[PDB]
Amino acid sequence: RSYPAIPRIYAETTLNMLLKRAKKPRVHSIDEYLKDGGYQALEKALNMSPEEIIDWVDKSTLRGRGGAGFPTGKKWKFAVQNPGPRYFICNADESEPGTFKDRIIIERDPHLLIEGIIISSYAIGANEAYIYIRGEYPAGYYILRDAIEEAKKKGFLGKNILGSGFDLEIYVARGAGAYICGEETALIESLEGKRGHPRLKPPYPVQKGLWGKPTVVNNVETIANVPFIISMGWEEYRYIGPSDYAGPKLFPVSGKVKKPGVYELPMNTTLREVIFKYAGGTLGNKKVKAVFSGALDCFSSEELDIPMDYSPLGFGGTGTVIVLTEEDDIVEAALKIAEFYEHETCGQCTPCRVGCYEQANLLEKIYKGEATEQDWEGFDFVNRNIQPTSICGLGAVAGRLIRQTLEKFPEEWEKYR
Amino acid sequence: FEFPEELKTKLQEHINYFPKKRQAILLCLHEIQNYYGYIPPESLKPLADMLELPLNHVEGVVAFYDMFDREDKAKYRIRVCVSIVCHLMGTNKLLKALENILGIKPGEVTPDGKFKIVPVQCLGACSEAPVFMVNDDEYKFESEVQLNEILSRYT
Ligand SMILES: NC(=O)c1ccc[n+]([C@@H]2O[C@H](COP(=O)([O-])OP(=O)(O)OC[C@H]3O[C@@H](n4cnc5c(N)ncnc54)[C@H](O)[C@@H]3O)[C@@H](O)[C@H]2O)c1
Ligand SMILES: Cc1cc2nc3c(=O)[nH]c(=O)nc-3n(C[C@H](O)[C@H](O)[C@H](O)COP(=O)(O)O)c2cc1C
Ligand code: SF4
Ligand code: FES
């Protein structure tokens, strides 16, 4: 009944789907959930074949909400071609700077998440499912354990769910300070009781995941879309937003905005609209210097008119919007991104291990005026050579945003030389 | 070394929760840090036995995960976010206020073993920057007077 204190993050929706309840900053229990027609998509899904469900999710055009945007129906198809037992995992690791969209679903509408997990589990024929939540979300952990007990009590979990013959247990696991555990293979290793070290892919988890068995890993926000897909049908779900990037999308907006929070909008929305039409514009009406797409991209004030979709000229990522204004030093900002990667490399890969450490160590020297001409030249080189031999996406991106700032704001960088 | 029945039951509860005992390592460690206010080195051998894992395994895990500290004992762990958004919104003002109130800087513990400042990466509450946690409880920093009232709730 009494959970740890959690900040009341502002949430706003134009679609009233993923945020229908989670727009209110409080735990919505099972009776409140059922009252809104909750768990009725589950009832409908149990009457359908697991294959029908996969087909509906494919046709809905739902793409992964955990940053890479892979087609979900397709991912489920890949797993089902290899024999069972199969495992379903909810990625609730959310450790990306500026990303706090998944936590409001967990903490405020846990049953929306649970419901998606059960439909998704039934779809791939997983009789065992996991929620891997980060250790810095203890309230979300207790909210989920309590809600899982509520669903088990109402007969949505256990053996022979609602007389369908489908069995399911959802287990809740906790991370412990490792960003890399959000990477699916490192997450699986951590579920097995080991260190969060990513495995070499291929094999992809759908072939060999948890206990070497076919495993589907999906993000909190992705799963939360599944009860909506089943309830309204794929056709009517495809009506939301543009037809090429359809469905609701959560955008966590922070930094130098008047109204920081999570916004549920269609993916046809421009970055400009997100900042000025929805987040109420910049704090103090200062001009936007840049926008950081998590610890991944940097968008100058010249690129605000781009769509918030999965297109090549689109914003992409998790739709994380960190707004920087004219008085914010880009080199001071880039140092904070470098520090993040230095702190998060698992160290398996030598160029990632040394590259992430060196980029932050040298950039700090740049900022504090301790930089020699060789530290400057070495910084540039190390920033371009973190990716070689890397087996996971971390090494591949560690220098991406920092490279972008160098190319987009040379003046501010040259002042430090 | 023997865990009190208060903690031993909780550990078995976590160990019997997942299909395999070894999967409960992170949950067990979290419970060990909650009880002792750190990870005692002596507690690693009994846990390795309960998990049916070798000692080297458990030691490697405690070392790998940042939420674990086998050095200092603190009743309250003030986790302070030092990432991009919190930095932009006033992490320095939060750390300066903390230093004025408790006399300690990040990485230090108060003389009474009550409070420890832990610099952490993004806590995923960036809209509420500057963010800090006091054990499991999470808050947005407004001011030293505000902060002072929050900290006073920790006895
Ligand atoms: N939401 C967050 O909190 C958060 C935090 C950090 C990073 N991320 C995101 O993570 C992304 C990088 O993730 P990634 O390296 O997992 O991406 P990826 O492109 O390699 O793969 C994404 C997904 O598709 C599946 N997949 C890809 N190719 C496949 C194939 N041929 N067969 C079967 N399955 C296949 C994978 O199993 C995985 O689940 C970044 O864009 C970043 O934004 C998100
Ligand atoms: C270093 C790293 C960290 C990641 N962290 C997360 C995370 O916190 N949450 C998440 O859902 N996906 C994260 N991902 C992406 C996952 O590996 C994976 O693609 C995703 O969970 C699959 O779900 P989706 O298809 O629904 O998007 C991370 C990837 C990398 C490379
Ligand atoms: S690229 Fe870096 S984070 Fe990824 S597996 Fe290699 S060492 Fe670990
Ligand atoms: S940057 Fe501090 S909570 Fe995200």
Numbering used by the authors:
A (entry chain B): 2 to 418
B (entry chain A): 6 to 160
Can I see the authors' text?
Complex I couples the transfer of two electrons from NADH to ubiquinone (Q) with the translocation of four protons across the membrane. The L-shaped complex is structured into a peripheral arm that protrudes into the aqueous milieu and catalyzes electron transfer with one FMN and 8–10 iron–sulfur ([Fe–S]) clusters, and a membrane arm embedded in the lipid bilayer that mediates proton translocation. We have determined structures of the electron-input module of complex I from the hyperthermophilic bacterium Aquifex aeolicus, encompassing subunits NuoE and NuoF that contain the FMN cofactor, the [4Fe–4S] cluster N3, and the [2Fe–2S] cluster N1a, respectively, both in the air-oxidized and dithionite-reduced states at resolutions up to 1.8 Å. Here, we show that the redox state of N1a regulates NADH oxidation in complex I by inducing a conformational change close to the NADH-binding site.
However, when bound to the reduced enzyme, the NAD+ nicotinamide adopts a position closer to the tight position because the carbonyl group favors the position facing cluster N1a. This allows the nicotinamide to occupy the tight position although this is a non-productive state of the enzyme/substrate complex.
